[PDB]
Design an enzyme around this catalytic site. Structure first.
Site, PDB file in Angstrom:
ATOM      1  N   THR B  11      27.855  33.565  35.560  1.00 30.67           N
ATOM      2  CA  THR B  11      28.052  32.347  35.781  1.00 30.67           C
ATOM      3  C   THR B  11      26.644  31.707  36.146  1.00 30.67           C
ATOM      4  OG1 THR B  11      29.329  33.302  37.561  1.00 30.67           O
ATOM      5  CG2 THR B  11      30.494  31.944  36.298  1.00 30.67           C
ATOM      6  N   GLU B  12      26.275  30.447  36.043  1.00 32.02           N
ATOM      7  CA  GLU B  12      24.960  30.140  36.573  1.00 32.02           C
ATOM      8  C   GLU B  12      23.848  30.820  35.994  1.00 32.02           C
ATOM      9  OE1 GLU B  12      23.400  30.401  40.652  1.00 32.02           O
ATOM     10  OE2 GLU B  12      22.744  28.299  40.791  1.00 32.02           O
ATOM     11  N   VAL B  13      23.999  31.042  34.513  1.00 28.58           N
ATOM     12  CA  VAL B  13      22.728  31.613  33.931  1.00 28.58           C
ATOM     13  C   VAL B  13      22.288  30.606  33.152  1.00 28.58           C
ATOM     14  CG1 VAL B  13      23.777  33.915  33.832  1.00 28.58           C
ATOM     15  CG2 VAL B  13      24.171  32.396  31.949  1.00 28.58           C
ATOM     16  N   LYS B  15      23.744  28.457  30.651  1.00 29.57           N
ATOM     17  CA  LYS B  15      24.220  28.485  29.261  1.00 29.57           C
ATOM     18  C   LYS B  15      24.196  27.311  28.664  1.00 29.57           C
ATOM     19  CE  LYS B  15      28.634  28.988  29.238  1.00 29.57           C
ATOM     20  NZ  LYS B  15      29.978  29.416  29.632  1.00 29.57           N
ATOM     21  N   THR B  16      24.543  25.931  29.556  1.00 29.87           N
ATOM     22  CA  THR B  16      24.518  24.700  28.753  1.00 29.87           C
ATOM     23  C   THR B  16      23.154  24.327  28.545  1.00 29.87           C
ATOM     24  OG1 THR B  16      26.552  24.487  29.875  1.00 29.87           O
ATOM     25  CG2 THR B  16      25.517  22.435  28.820  1.00 29.87           C
ATOM     26  N   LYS B  37      33.264  22.291  23.545  1.00 27.04           N
ATOM     27  CA  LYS B  37      33.720  22.887  24.433  1.00 27.04           C
ATOM     28  C   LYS B  37      35.024  22.837  24.661  1.00 27.04           C
ATOM     29  CE  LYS B  37      32.499  24.065  29.351  1.00 27.04           C
ATOM     30  NZ  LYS B  37      31.936  25.376  29.456  1.00 27.04           N
ATOM     31  N   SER B  41      36.816  23.764  33.067  1.00 29.84           N
ATOM     32  CA  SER B  41      37.359  23.674  34.581  1.00 29.84           C
ATOM     33  C   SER B  41      36.131  23.226  35.440  1.00 29.84           C
ATOM     34  CB  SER B  41      37.975  24.827  34.866  1.00 29.84           C
ATOM     35  OG  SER B  41      37.114  26.079  34.567  1.00 29.84           O
ATOM     36  N   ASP B  54      28.972  19.686  31.770  1.00 34.42           N
ATOM     37  CA  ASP B  54      28.728  20.424  30.714  1.00 34.42           C
ATOM     38  C   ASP B  54      29.035  19.951  29.247  1.00 34.42           C
ATOM     39  OD1 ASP B  54      27.459  22.127  32.310  1.00 34.42           O
ATOM     40  OD2 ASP B  54      29.207  23.554  32.318  1.00 34.42           O
ATOM     41  N   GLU B 115      30.915  26.387  22.924  1.00 37.25           N
ATOM     42  CA  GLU B 115      30.516  26.878  24.229  1.00 37.25           C
ATOM     43  C   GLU B 115      31.800  27.427  24.633  1.00 37.25           C
ATOM     44  OE1 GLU B 115      29.018  24.974  27.794  1.00 37.25           O
ATOM     45  OE2 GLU B 115      27.129  25.129  26.759  1.00 37.25           O
ATOM     46  N   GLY B 116      31.852  28.542  25.249  1.00 40.87           N
ATOM     47  CA  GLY B 116      33.120  29.031  26.161  1.00 40.87           C
ATOM     48  C   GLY B 116      33.005  28.513  27.593  1.00 40.87           C
ATOM     49  N   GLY B 118      32.993  30.218  31.384  1.00 43.68           N
ATOM     50  CA  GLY B 118      32.557  31.548  32.167  1.00 43.68           C
ATOM     51  C   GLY B 118      32.096  32.565  31.382  1.00 43.68           C
ATOM     52  N   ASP B 176      14.877  31.117  32.069  1.00 41.33           N
ATOM     53  CA  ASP B 176      14.073  31.751  33.407  1.00 41.33           C
ATOM     54  C   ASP B 176      15.027  30.927  34.444  1.00 41.33           C
ATOM     55  OD1 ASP B 176      12.656  33.035  31.699  1.00 41.33           O
ATOM     56  OD2 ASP B 176      11.013  31.758  31.722  1.00 41.33           O
ATOM     57  N   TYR B 187      10.720  42.884  32.579  1.00 42.95           N
ATOM     58  CA  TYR B 187      12.113  42.654  32.195  1.00 42.95           C
ATOM     59  C   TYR B 187      12.467  42.161  31.063  1.00 42.95           C
ATOM     60  CZ  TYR B 187      15.563  43.616  36.196  1.00 42.95           C
ATOM     61  OH  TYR B 187      16.273  44.200  36.979  1.00 42.95           O
ATOM     62  N   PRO B 204      11.487  27.847  29.923  1.00 43.51           N
ATOM     63  CA  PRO B 204      10.810  28.267  31.210  1.00 43.51           C
ATOM     64  C   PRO B 204      11.972  27.601  32.435  1.00 43.51           C
ATOM     65  CG  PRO B 204       9.833  26.452  29.875  1.00 43.51           C
ATOM     66  CD  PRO B 204      10.898  27.101  28.932  1.00 43.51           C
ATOM     67  N   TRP B 205      11.559  28.047  33.413  1.00 39.97           N
ATOM     68  CA  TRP B 205      11.827  27.538  34.857  1.00 39.97           C
ATOM     69  C   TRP B 205      11.742  26.124  34.922  1.00 39.97           C
ATOM     70  CZ3 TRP B 205       9.676  25.984  39.578  1.00 39.97           C
ATOM     71  CH2 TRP B 205      10.620  25.589  40.566  1.00 39.97           C
TER      72      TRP B 205
HETATM   73  C1  LIG Z   1      17.285  47.032  43.790  1.00 37.03           C
HETATM   74  C2  LIG Z   1      18.368  47.065  43.530  1.00 37.03           C
HETATM   75  N1  LIG Z   1      19.271  47.287  45.219  1.00 37.03           N
HETATM   76  C3  LIG Z   1      18.813  48.635  42.957  1.00 37.03           C
HETATM   77  C4  LIG Z   1      18.463  48.197  41.500  1.00 37.03           C
HETATM   78  C5  LIG Z   1      18.981  47.494  40.762  1.00 37.03           C
HETATM   79  C6  LIG Z   1      18.522  47.508  39.374  1.00 37.03           C
HETATM   80  C7  LIG Z   1      19.189  46.536  38.201  1.00 37.03           C
HETATM   81  C8  LIG Z   1      18.952  46.824  36.764  1.00 37.03           C
HETATM   82  C9  LIG Z   1      19.094  45.527  36.068  1.00 37.03           C
HETATM   83  O1  LIG Z   1      18.620  44.537  35.815  1.00 37.03           O
HETATM   84  O2  LIG Z   1      20.288  45.800  35.304  1.00 37.03           O
HETATM   85  N2  LIG Z   1      18.477  49.649  43.530  1.00 37.03           N
HETATM   86  C10 LIG Z   1      19.027  50.545  44.504  1.00 37.03           C
HETATM   87  O3  LIG Z   1      20.293  50.174  44.562  1.00 37.03           O
HETATM   88  O4  LIG Z   1      18.423  51.690  44.973  1.00 37.03           O
HETATM   89  C1  LIG Z   2      34.236  26.902  36.742  1.00 36.08           C
HETATM   90  C2  LIG Z   2      33.324  27.616  35.845  1.00 36.08           C
HETATM   91  N1  LIG Z   2      31.909  26.632  35.438  1.00 36.08           N
HETATM   92  C3  LIG Z   2      34.057  27.976  34.433  1.00 36.08           C
HETATM   93  C4  LIG Z   2      35.014  29.019  34.486  1.00 36.08           C
HETATM   94  C5  LIG Z   2      34.676  30.511  35.227  1.00 36.08           C
HETATM   95  C6  LIG Z   2      35.863  31.373  34.953  1.00 36.08           C
HETATM   96  C7  LIG Z   2      35.358  32.687  35.442  1.00 36.08           C
HETATM   97  C8  LIG Z   2      36.507  33.810  35.223  1.00 36.08           C
HETATM   98  C9  LIG Z   2      36.185  35.020  35.804  1.00 36.08           C
HETATM   99  O1  LIG Z   2      36.087  35.230  37.224  1.00 36.08           O
HETATM  100  O2  LIG Z   2      35.574  36.038  35.098  1.00 36.08           O
HETATM  101  N2  LIG Z   2      34.249  26.611  33.974  1.00 36.08           N
HETATM  102  C10 LIG Z   2      33.717  26.095  32.853  1.00 36.08           C
HETATM  103  O3  LIG Z   2      32.807  26.548  32.580  1.00 36.08           O
HETATM  104  O4  LIG Z   2      34.216  24.950  32.374  1.00 36.08           O
END
Ligand SMILES: C[C@H](N)[C@@H](CCCCCC(=O)O)NC(=O)O
Ligand SMILES: C[C@H](N)[C@@H](CCCCCC(=O)O)NC(=O)O
Lengths: 219, 219
Positions: B11-13, B15-16, B37, B41, B54, B115-116, B118, B176, B187, B204-205
């Site tokens: 969530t909050e990556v 996607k839209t 979509k 919700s 979205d 778009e789904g 979640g 980003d 990464y 980009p961010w």
């Molecule tokens: C720094 C974090 N706490 C953890 C390492 C996280 C690796 C995440 C890799 C990924 O992006 O999937 N290190 C540790 O538990 O010792």
């Molecule tokens: C409220 C969120 N943004 C999203 C629904 C998230 C469902 C998450 C289910 C889970 O816990 O895996 N709704 C939506 O995109 O319309």
């Protein structure tokens, strides 16, 4: 020895909180216990070397007195993926050292809890992930689920991947990472129905003595 | 029509954001485009009914003028899992309505982006997940990865589960979600090596015109 591997659905789901609760319950049931965190990144400097706080929690929750390096052979300062800082520092993370360390604990403990770094698929090298070592050691897996929006999806992805690797999902633990919210009961019901393994217990939101929230009789 | 399903690692990556960048690039390549979509919700009240932001972004980034209900048949006010609020409100989410809506768009658009809600395994009912409808429609999947600590694990879990379902992972998009940090390049290299599908571009961010960051020639 009974041996378990603990993994979490996401970073900051409180996996070491659930590991210490598991360790406390096992000690109450009369086991000689040991926590093991073979790899850790995100460590502090002290007069004796780098010390990672999660590893220190496992050391002080074990019922055997254990030296730090026995609990955590590989300690990296930077909080990033282990394969990045391993390469950076020129210190390979070797599967044989990780396995030797587990055997060494099994000499003295009869209940060993093994905590990974990150989530299931954390890379240890460019050709080796944490998942490869756990499959190789054939460890049963306990999943820690932080209850929040988005955890159903993460708990289901992780559960299908462990089963696909032919490993036993021994059970799951619900960790309340936020105060009580509106859909807490409905989330706990959906997670119980969908994760194919027993719920071992639920740890409430607390911003230490947590063994009581775990039912070790289901493991 | 070309059709794609967009899913995210968490969530909050953003996607839209990636869906609008995809829609902008397709329009630049000369396609008559439509965003879809089926379920949303977390919606606002307006004089015409509930509107999800979205969904509104997909409507205004489509090159066809489209009515809101065509873009988003199922709109729920509460931001929780669709199966909880569907049950609460007494409005079943029907697979046939979700598929009918996609066909209706295919009458008029030749490039449709779906778009789904979640992540992959979002429940739509107690016996039906979003993953079941996508497998049934045999849609190719585009994965959006927010680049942050923990995304390697989530990108790998999602990628293996889609392939296990026999679907095509058409590609991935890196979003980003934070300002530039220390291990950004490392990464991006690990994610490129491990996700079995082409990287379509990196956004980009930015705390709108983003089509340029997408290479549609790899889809
Ligand atoms: C720094 C974090 N706490 C953890 C390492 C996280 C690796 C995440 C890799 C990924 O992006 O999937 N290190 C540790 O538990 O010792
Ligand atoms: C409220 C969120 N943004 C999203 C629904 C998230 C469902 C998450 C289910 C889970 O816990 O895996 N709704 C939506 O995109 O319309």
């Amino acid at each position: 020895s009974k041996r378990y591997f603990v993994t979490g659905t996401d970073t900051e789901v409180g996996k070491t909180v659930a590991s210490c609760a598991l360790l406390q319950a096992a000690k109450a049931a009369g086991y000689r216990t040991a926590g093991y965190k073979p790899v850790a990144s995100g460590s502090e400097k002290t007069p004796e070397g780098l010390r990672n706080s999660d590893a220190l929690a496992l050391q002080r929750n074990s019922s055997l007195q254990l030296d730090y390096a026995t609990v955590n052979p590989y300690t990296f300062a930077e909080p990033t993926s282990p394969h990045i800082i391993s390469a950076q520092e020129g210190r390979p993370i070797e599967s044989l050292v990780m396995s030797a360390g587990l055997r060494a604990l099994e000499q003295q403990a009869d209940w060993v809890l093994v905590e990974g770094a990150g989530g299931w698929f954390t890379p240890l090298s460019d050709t080796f992930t944490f998942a490869d070592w756990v499959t190789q050691e054939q460890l049963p897996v306990i999943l820690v689920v932080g209850v929040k929006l988005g955890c159903i999806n993460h708990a289901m992805l992780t559960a299908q991947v462990i089963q696909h690797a032919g490993l036993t999902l021994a059970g799951w633990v619900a960790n309340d990472v936020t105060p009580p919210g509106k859909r807490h009961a409905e989330y706990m019901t959906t997670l119980t129905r969908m994760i194919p393994a027993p719920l071992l217990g639920e740890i409430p939101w607390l911003a230490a003595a947590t063994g009581k929230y775990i039912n070790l009789a289901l493991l």
